[PDB]
């Protein structure tokens, strides 16, 4: 017929057309998280919004390189250098550095997480922004691995509300990727979630990430409808807008018919 029929039973992911000044990159908020607390980040409510009930440590904006790869120091014979986790051995040393004299189980201070001086050993962070699909079709987001706990949410009223990026987190636990650290221990690699997206609409995107001890890891990718993969550097795909709670037409509940 003259018009597309629309995704079945309001199935389309909600998106946005914010009218304000677009900024390259995502906003990163940092929140307090306790060293060796392996239980707090196992709860859906905590990972969706509860993190923001803890002390906010700071923020950085305009981040396009969004993967996390934090390595603890090895205090070695030849100085102090970051140790790739797969190179750690024994009790303990780091391959090519010898034995390390420092503890794996204390807090360490570093700017490795987006240049913000904090404790990547123990912290929770919230990345927010809008994903701009250049192509219409199925997009598959993935975490290659999760160390320690993480979620990824896409869509208006799922990640956050349109034109309200900077507001307190919404309560939705309808995660696109659920990488929450299981209670019973365990969890596989290459965890994934798929969203059908219409080109040129801005899709709210939230990533919440937490680490309790030592190494922290979150390699983020998206496979595009053309089958190519974008990993780590999402420049050209992720943007921020200052809140405009007064922009009435900002929410597009169904981009398939808009
Ligand atoms: Cl180091
Ligand atoms: Cl060695
Ligand atoms: Gd990176
Ligand atoms: Gd980089
Ligand atoms: Gd890093
Ligand atoms: Gd870094
Ligand atoms: Gd690095
Ligand atoms: Gd880096
Ligand atoms: Gd909503
Ligand atoms: Gd960790
Ligand atoms: Gd594919
Ligand atoms: Gd890098
Ligand atoms: Gd603002």
Swiss-Prot record:
Subcellular compartments: Secreted, Cell wall; Membrane
Residues covered by the PA14 domain: 61-236
Region entry Sugar recognition, spans: 184-227
PTMs per UniProt: Extensively O-glycosylated. The GPI-anchor is attached to the protein in the endoplasmic reticulum and serves to target the protein to the cell surface. There, the glucosamine-inositol phospholipid moiety is cleaved off and the GPI-modified mannoprotein is covalently attached via its lipidless GPI glycan remnant to the 1,6-beta-glucan of the outer cell wall layer.
Annotated glycosylation sites: 122, 174, 190, 249
Applied biotechnology: For many industrial applications in which the yeast S.cerevisiae is used, e.g. beer, wine and alcohol production, appropriate flocculation behavior is one of the most important characteristics of a good production strain. The ability of yeast cells to flocculate is of considerable importance, as it provides an effective, environment-friendly, simple and cost-free way to separate yeast cells from the fermentation product at the end of fermentation.
Function: Cell wall protein that participates directly in adhesive cell-cell interactions during yeast flocculation, a reversible, asexual and Ca(2+)-dependent process in which cells adhere to form aggregates (flocs) consisting of thousands of cells. The lectin-like protein sticks out of the cell wall of flocculent cells and selectively binds mannose residues in the cell walls of adjacent cells. Activity is inhibited by mannose, but not by glucose, maltose, sucrose or galactose.
Family from the record: Belongs to the flocculin family.
This protein's domain notes: The number of the intragenic tandem repeats varies between different S.cerevisiae strains. There is a linear correlation between protein size and the extend of adhesion: the more repeats, the stronger the adhesion properties and the greater the fraction of flocculating cells.
Protein name as annotated: Flocculation protein FLO5
Organism, scientific name: Saccharomyces cerevisiae (strain ATCC 204508 / S288c)
Residues shown, of full length: 23 to 271 of 1075
